[PDB]
Amino acid sequence: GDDRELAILATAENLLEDRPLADISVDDLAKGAGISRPTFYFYFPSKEAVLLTLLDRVVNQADMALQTLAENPADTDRENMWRTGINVFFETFGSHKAVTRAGQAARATSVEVAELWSTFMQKWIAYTAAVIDAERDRGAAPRTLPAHELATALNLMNERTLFASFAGEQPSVPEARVLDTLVHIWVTSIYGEN
Amino acid sequence: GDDRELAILATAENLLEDRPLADISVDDLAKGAGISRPTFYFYFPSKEAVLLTLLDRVVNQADMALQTLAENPADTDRENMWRTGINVFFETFGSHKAVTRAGQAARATSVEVAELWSTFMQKWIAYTAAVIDAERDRGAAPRTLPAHELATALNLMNERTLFASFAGEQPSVPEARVLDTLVHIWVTSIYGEN
Ligand SMILES: CCCCCCCCCCCCCCCCOC(=O)CCCCCCC
Numbered sequence: 482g483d484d485r486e487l488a489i490l491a492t493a494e495n496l497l498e499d500r501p502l503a504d505i506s507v508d509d510l511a512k513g514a515g516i517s518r519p520t521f522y523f524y525f526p527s528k529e530a531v532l533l534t535l536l537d538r539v540v541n542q543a544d545m546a547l548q549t550l551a552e553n554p555a556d557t558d559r560e561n562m563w564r565t566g567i568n569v570f571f572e573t574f575g576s577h578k579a580v581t582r583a584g585q586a587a588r589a590t591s592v593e594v595a596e597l598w599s600t601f602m603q604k605w606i607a608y609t610a611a612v613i614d615a616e617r618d619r620g621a622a623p624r625t626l627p628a629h630e631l632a633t634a635l636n637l638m639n640e641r642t643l644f645a646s647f648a649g650e651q652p653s654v655p656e657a658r659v660l661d662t663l664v665h666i667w668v669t670s671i672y673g674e675n
Numbered sequence: 676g677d678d679r680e681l682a683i684l685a686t687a688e689n690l691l692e693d694r695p696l697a698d699i700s701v702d703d704l705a706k707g708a709g710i711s712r713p714t715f716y717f718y719f720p721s722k723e724a725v726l727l728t729l730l731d732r733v734v735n736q737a738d739m740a741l742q743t744l745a746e747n748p749a750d751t752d753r754e755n756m757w758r759t760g761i762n763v764f765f766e767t768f769g770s771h772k773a774v775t776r777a778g779q780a781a782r783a784t785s786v787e788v789a790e791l792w793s794t795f796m797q798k799w800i801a802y803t804a805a806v807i808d809a810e811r812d813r814g815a816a817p818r819t820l821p822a823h824e825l826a827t828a829l830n831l832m833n834e835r836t837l838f839a840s841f842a843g844e845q846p847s848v849p850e851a852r853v854l855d856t857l858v859h860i861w862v863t864s865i866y867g868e869n
């Protein structure tokens with residue numbers, strides 16, 4: 482039943498491009514997937530469950546991509562190392578704006594969404610801290626702020642800043658400038674002595 | 676009618692300390708202020724309007740405080756200059772956690788709240804950019820990223836990071852460490868050459 486489940490997912494991601502989940506019905510998702518309404522309930526308990534699955538797929542895709550970089554570094558300087566890591570998130574979520582927006586708006590009423598985001602953020606923060614620590618160990622970065630607290634703030638900045646740019650918020654950094662903006666902040670705060 | 680209006684405001688801020696606005700009724704606010712329910716509607720059209728006023732008071736208090744610092748600098752180094760500026764927000768909103776939380780949760784359904792926050796953020800971003808520019812003009816800070824884009828990201832980081840700390844989110848920087856964390860990121864990214 483992958484086809485019909487994927488068809489429900491694709492339909493949902495497509496519609497979420499024009500309106501919020503609240504304005505999307507199970508029938509819409511059903512008609513979109515070419516199945517009946519009761520048959521939808523065979524794959525998902527609710528439309529909120531569909532969005533959750535969508536976010537879970539986007540989140541894991543970014544995580545897997547980062548995992549790929551971890552295993553296969555890249556012959557380049559330290560500035561580029563961080564840029565490639567940040568780019569994983571700019572590109573993954575930037576290629577799924579509708580789901581990112583819907584996912585954010587869902588956090589307020591979905592503990593599933595909240596816990597999913599929280600778990601990976603902790604995961605991405607722990608990795609950033611490990612890289613910073615490794616960087617400090619080799620003598621490249623000065624031992625300034627506690628690595629994990631620095632990593633948390635930088636990660637929270639990206640979460641908020643990338644979202645603002647993807648959503649075209651007021652205020653926000655233009656999407657065409659956001660990667661460079663974040664990379665500079667990460668690089669100066671990680672290697673800066675003061 | 677200041678007394679009764681202020682009594683409605685105080686009552687609301689007090690209750691918001693234990694539960695969300697949704698779990699607070701106009702009667703609660705009414706009983707809390709020692710007036711009847713219909714008399715409440717004499718000062719505010721709704722409870723959502725009360726929270727808006729509360730946020731507006733907290734936002735302006737921070738703005739006025741920053742304005743005071745602008746007019747009356749402080750004989751100290753550049754690192755301390757930024758710390759005092761950031762402290763205005765850490766202290767003002769940190770002394771009104773309930774209203775800050777409620778205010779954030781209200782943004783999703785209140786354009787009044789959204790526009791209020793947006794207007795001052797733009798204002799605080801413009802000021803940060805002016806200081807950065809002044810700093811660059813005098814030769815203290817290197818001309819790296821466009822000042823306004825750097826200012827936007829730093830401000831968005833504070834908004835997200837301070838909120839996470841005040842709310843005790845997972846993940847978050849402990850409140851007792853957040854000021855230092857942010858000041859370091861601001862200082863290194865503003866004066867850092869690379
Ligand atoms: C070697 C280099 C390492 C680089 C690590 C980079 C890690 C940064 C991870 C944080 C950024 C995540 C991108 C988020 C974009 C918009 O996020 C939305 O918020 C998603 C919706 C989820 C709901 C939760 C809302 C608080």
Ligand SMILES: CCCCCCCCCCCCCCCCOC(=O)CCCCCCC
Pocket residue numbers: 756757759760761764768775776778779780782792799803806830831833834835837838
């Ligand atoms: C000379 C030094 C200048 C320093 C300037 C510092 C400016 C930083 C201003 C941004 C931080 C604001 C603090 C926010 C704390 C939590 O915010 C909540 O979000 C409030 C609720 C409002 C709802 C909107 C949610 C996006």
